[PDB]
Amino acid sequence: SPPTLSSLIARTEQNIEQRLPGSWPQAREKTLSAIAYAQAGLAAGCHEHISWVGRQIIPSTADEDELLEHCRFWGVRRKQATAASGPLTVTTSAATTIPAGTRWQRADGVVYSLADTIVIDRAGTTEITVTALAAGEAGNTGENTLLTLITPVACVVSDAITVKGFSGGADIESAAELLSRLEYRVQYPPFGGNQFDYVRWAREVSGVTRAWCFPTWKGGGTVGVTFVMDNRSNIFPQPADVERVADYIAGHTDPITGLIVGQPDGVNVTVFAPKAKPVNPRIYISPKTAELKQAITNAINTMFFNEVMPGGALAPSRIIRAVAGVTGLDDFEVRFPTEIQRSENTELLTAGTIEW
Amino acid sequence: HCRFWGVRRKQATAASGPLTVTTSAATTIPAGTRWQRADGVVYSLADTIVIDRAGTTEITVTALAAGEAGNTGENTLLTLITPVACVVSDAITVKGFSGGADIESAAELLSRLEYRVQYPPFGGNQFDYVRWAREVSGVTRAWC
Amino acid sequence: TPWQTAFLQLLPSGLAWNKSPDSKLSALAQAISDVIATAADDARQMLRERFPSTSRWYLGEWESFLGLPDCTSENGTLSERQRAAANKMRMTGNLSRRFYEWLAAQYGFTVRLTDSTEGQWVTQVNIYGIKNYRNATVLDNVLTPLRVYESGALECLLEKYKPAHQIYKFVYHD
Amino acid sequence: MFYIDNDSGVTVMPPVSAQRSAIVRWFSEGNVITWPGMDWFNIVQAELLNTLEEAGIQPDKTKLNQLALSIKAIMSNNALLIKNNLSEIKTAGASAQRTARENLDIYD
Amino acid sequence: MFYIDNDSGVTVMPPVSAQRSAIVRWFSEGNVITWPGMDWFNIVQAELLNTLEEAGIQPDKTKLNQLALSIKAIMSNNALLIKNNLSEIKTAGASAQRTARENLDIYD
Amino acid sequence: TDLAIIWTNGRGDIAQDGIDMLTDDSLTTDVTISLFTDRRALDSDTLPDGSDDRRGWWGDSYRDRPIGSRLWLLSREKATPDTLERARGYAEEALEWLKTAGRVSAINVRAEQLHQGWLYLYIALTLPDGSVIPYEFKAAFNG
């Protein structure tokens, strides 16, 4: 919190008056006043530089390059971008050789380049595998798309339609994602056997959105893990997902040191999947419209995603807050959830269909 | 032109602010007490205030100089001119004085005259009654 | 002051100028250079703010970034807030009883993890030298009492950072 | 200087509260916990600053013996000094010397 | 004794930061509550200890009148006394008497 | 209207007056600055000291012109006409920047030896018709 320019003016004037007794530098159109103003301006510039030197001590408020340096020091590693690829099914008209390095551009502008030379000896379609040069999320396309030809070949039709689209296009993690990962790492320290350790282990595996760990689940020697994948439509684990998460917790190499880390040898983890326990509210809306249907549904879904945990009890007020968060409607009285709903650790609360 | 039309120029305005003064034994400040600045501009309090106990009190004081010069800043020290019993000649002004507007400029006066010329008549309407009720100082909400 | 000496040295050198320590040039140089002196003091204290163990301006930010405010951070003592931040920032360790004793003692307490009494997993946290009084330092507020009495800071800390499989059993000694 | 130079302070002092106890009170760590408050600190700081002002020395931060210099300055401004050898009477005027001789019983 | 003997003080006094505000600043509990800091405590105890050392009195925790004794010692060292009858100015030397009398206009 | 330089005890300094410092809006300050601040000596000059340091100002490479006068080379001289001639030349060179502009019309400087041990310089300018009345003071001693 640097001092303001007027405060700096006042401070310089007080210093001048203290050092030269009997003087009043605040007088208008005077040498001491001009000197005080100039010194105040210089001090304001200096204090602004000090403030910029600050504010980069912590990774949260740091600038871009300093944030990247902080993450690199703390050990957060980025994920590099990929490139899309797939078949082309290009049609020729005679025997010809498509030289290696030819390019097929799509309407958008993305350019896909052939890797190895191909020799054709018939007047018919031939399938070749091409990879994108963009190397980003824009690489992958739909199912039957058209690609033109940047420069003509000896006897090849310019257009080329891909029956099965390209796939494998990803983006490098952004600074916001890196900062979030570093913040999570700092907030929840690694111990090797803690509840946060089990949660982060179950979250590091690809595709998993949320996880929970119950210590001393079924006695003094065992624990419990329960994960929920929110990207997928089901949003509940499968046996294959459960066994692969158990494998990952049992053993996985650490990218930093190259050694494998995991659970202790004396504990019983037994990761399992939750069981849905839906609740069906009955909310009355004054204006009945599809926009309010969507808004209330999305608010309730988010409310659950935020403040619902397996084994926990949700008060009826939560639904009321979620439905009141909407703007257009006038009345939002709920009728079904008038009592507190609770469940066991195996049971996971979920928002069932709403009966308007 | 302004004299003919009916627009009057706005003269220079004083500057008012808080005076933090402490008394010794709870005296009554007269109606016209005066304080002085180092440069030699006079400030006056036109009111009467009785102090209950020995402590610092804030009083609204307006300058006696019409121009912008009578406009101090932060933490400016002021002293009394005529001694008052159980009052120490000290004034701090934690908040600086505000005000100090000089005479109106030619462009501002021209804009005011053009406003007077171009503004329309406002016959009694449900919207206009709201403004007329709300223009009075203190009134904050109106309904017609 | 060294800053006024620097200003006087920056001013021109000649017969017309008087740089003796009693002249008006010196008396004005002190006032001119004191502002930059305060600025340099602020820029120097940023070096102390660099760490959460000694930071005073950025305690709020160091707590928000770390998610600090929790059981192990005491009621209002700025020294204890600094200690909690400085321990949470560099707390990584194993599950052994030796490490748990070291971690508990790093906060000022004294415990020993002795063997069970009824089972195998239920280790006994024998807490010695219990003292709930924390002396008000010079950093904290002017309105704080001389002693702040806080209890149960170690209990929830150890229950939060305990191994997932194990369950502790606390016993207080004197 | 001797006052609090931190960013936390008010340029106008808060008035002291009224008297509550007619008996001298003290501090105690243990049996009621005591807190300093603004009044005690303000009183001590104001006593030191007013002693300095009476001596005429303006407060400065680098120096620490200003209280001793204040006591010595009051001593010189009010009492005679061994090193001065009764120079203040003369400095005052001629009637002062006349009255000093009168008190020492030195007639013409 | 007088200083911090609570096993919480450093042997070497930390340096005092430069002056920030020129005007006097007082304590206040209510718009940001102020804290004393190390500089205020160090300055106050340094002034008291400097007065004690100027008087030539070594600090001792048992006694609680050493400031009054210090002021009295400064008096007995640097001032004339009523019980001495000017003896201090005449045990110094003959030149002191000569200067005193020529000042008091008592010469040949 | 900058600060004025007032000479006391043979050493000039800024001075106060009422509320703030004394101000000057004439050639007096300009002349008393251009005459009595040491400028950088040339490479080939022999310094009066036994040292090897030449004076000047850190702003000489920022102000488009050397600041003052080379009168400091005559710190220790004997009573010979060579020193008088050199002092005349140095004063002319130091104050010719005014004649280069239009602030003065002519400069007439003479050097002499008054009562034994006095290096007397008489510098008379010719201000133009529009120049303001210059300041007026005398060197003073105290204590």
Swiss-Prot record, chain A:
Residue runs in coiled coils: none
Gene Ontology CC terms, in alphabetical order: host cell cytoplasm; virus tail, baseplate
Key words, A-Z: Host cytoplasm, Late protein, Viral baseplate protein, Viral release from host cell, Viral tail assembly, Viral tail protein, Virion
Signal peptide from the UniProt entry: none
Keyword Hydrolase included in the entry's annotation: no
Assigned protein family: Belongs to the Mu gp47/PBSX XkdT family.
Annotated protein name in UniProt: Baseplate protein gp47
Organism: Escherichia phage Mu (Bacteriophage Mu)
Swiss-Prot record, chain C:
GO terms under biological process: viral tail assembly
Presence of the UniProt keyword Kinase in the record: no
Pfam families linked to this entry: Phage_Mu_Gp48
Matches recorded under InterPro entries: Phage_Mu_Gp48
Protein location: Virion; Host cytoplasm
The organism's place on the tree of life at top rank: Viruses
Induction remarks: Expressed in the late phase of the viral replicative cycle. Expression of late genes is activated by the viral late transcription activator C.
Subunit structure: Part of a complex composed of three DNA circularization protein N, three baseplate hub protein gp44 and three sub-complex wedge (made of two copies of each baseplate protein gp46, gp47 and gp48) that forms the baseplate.
Identification of the protein by name: Baseplate protein gp48
From Swiss-Prot, chains D, E:
Function according to Swiss-Prot or TrEMBL: Component of the tail fiber that acts as a receptor binding protein. Binds to the primary receptor, thereby determining the host range. Two alternate tail fiber S and S' proteins are encoded extending the host range of the virus.
Protein name according to UniProt: Tail fiber protein S
Expression induction or repression: Expressed in the late phase of the viral replicative cycle. Expression of late genes is activated by the viral late transcription activator C. Expressed alternatively with tail fiber protein S' (associated with tail fiber assembly protein U'). The switch from S-U to S'-U' occurs through inversion of a DNA segment called G by the phage invertase protein Gin.
Further remarks about this protein from its record: The orientation of the G segment is defined as G+ and G-. G+ orientation provides S-U fibers whereas G- provides S'-U' fibers. S-U and S'-U' dont have the same host range (e.g. respectively E.coli and C.freundii).
Subcellular location: Virion; Host cytoplasm
Gene disruption: observed consequences: Viral particles lack tail fibers in inversion-defective gin mutants (blocked in G+ orientation; no switch to S'-U').
Family: Belongs to the caudovirales tail fiber protein family.
Disulfide cross-links: none
Source organism of the structure: Escherichia phage Mu
Gene that produces this protein: S
Bilayer-spanning residue ranges: none
From Swiss-Prot, chain F:
Compartment(s): Virion; Host cytoplasm
Record's keyword annotation contains Transport: no
One Pfam family named in its UniProt record: GP46
An example Gene Ontology CC term for this record: virus tail, baseplate
Keywords, ordered alphabetically: Host cytoplasm, Late protein, Viral baseplate protein, Viral release from host cell, Viral tail assembly, Viral tail protein, Virion
Expression triggers: Expressed in the late phase of the viral replicative cycle. Expression of late genes is activated by the viral late transcription activator C.
Phenotype of the disrupted gene, per the record: No tail is synthesized.
One BP annotation, GO: viral tail assembly
Top-level taxon in the UniProt lineage: Viruses
Physiological role: Component of the baseplate. Probable connector between the central and peripheral parts of the baseplate. Probably involved in tail assembly.
Designated name of the protein: Baseplate protein gp46
Organism of derivation: Escherichia phage Mu (Bacteriophage Mu)
